[PDB]
């Protein structure tokens, strides 16, 4: 199974300023994942371009599962992201009606 470290859209320890530079002028559905500001292992933050803004979505992690809200149903961050490449986040929040379309790639 592909690891999070090897995902093209996972940038690790980068700042919001760096994220905002990468998302400037990008279309809706542009996205990346970075480590959460808490700097706690297993805590990550999805940044999604929508409406010219950079929306921050916490990735929750409990009991070996991940997700945006309870119930947490995904076995990895990679599985969570790949799911929303093909389903809108509108289910999580009506203001996030886009799929994850355009990864910001580190490769």
């Amino acid at each position: 199974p592909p690891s999070l470290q090897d995902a093209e859209w996972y940038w690790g320890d980068i700042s919001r300023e760096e994220v905002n530079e990468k998302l400037r002028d990008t279309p809706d559905g542009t996205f990346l994942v970075r480590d959460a500001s808490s700097k706690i292992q297993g805590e990550y933050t999805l940044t999604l371009r929508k409406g010219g803004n950079n929306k921050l979505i916490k990735v929750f992690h409990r009991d070996g599962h991940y997700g945006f809200s309870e119930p947490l149903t995904f076995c990895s961050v990679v599985d969570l992201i790949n799911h929303y490449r093909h389903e809108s986040l509108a289910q999580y929040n009506a203001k996030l009606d886009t799929r994850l379309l355009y990864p910001v790639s580190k490769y």
Partner: peptide, 5 residues
């Protein structure tokens, strides 16, 4: 902050 619930 700019976190979406």
């Amino acid at each position: 902050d700019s976190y979406v619930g």
